[PDB]
């Protein structure tokens, strides 16, 4: 991610040249369920957190 925040695929040569760390963004799907003792459950899924 450049200073301006634009993501760009990092080539290994750029990583060696610019002293970057050649890393892959890791995402996980998370499902949040909440119960408020009111015989009801709310289930929400945070995709690719």
């Amino acid at each position: 991610w450049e200073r301006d925040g634009a993501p760009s695929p990092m080539m290994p040569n750029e990583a060696r040249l610019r002293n970057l760390t050649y890393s892959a963004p890791l995402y996980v799907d998370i499902t949040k369920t909440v119960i408020k003792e009111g015989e009801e459950q709310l289930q929400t899924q945070h995709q690719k957190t």
Partner: protein, 44 residues
């Protein structure tokens, strides 16, 4: 003060104040242009 964009090899003049970003390609790797000074090599 000319720098050569490492990607598109396009020479661009950059001052002390402006960023390194390539004028056309936006690439951020710039190589200084070869010196105009005369360097002599004895062919030994």
């Amino acid at each position: 003060m000319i720098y050569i964009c490492g990607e598109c090899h396009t020479e661009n003049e950059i001052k002390s104040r402006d960023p390194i970003r390539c004028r056309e390609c936006g690439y951020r790797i710039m190589y200084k242009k070869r010196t105009k000074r005369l360097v002599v090599f004895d062919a030994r």
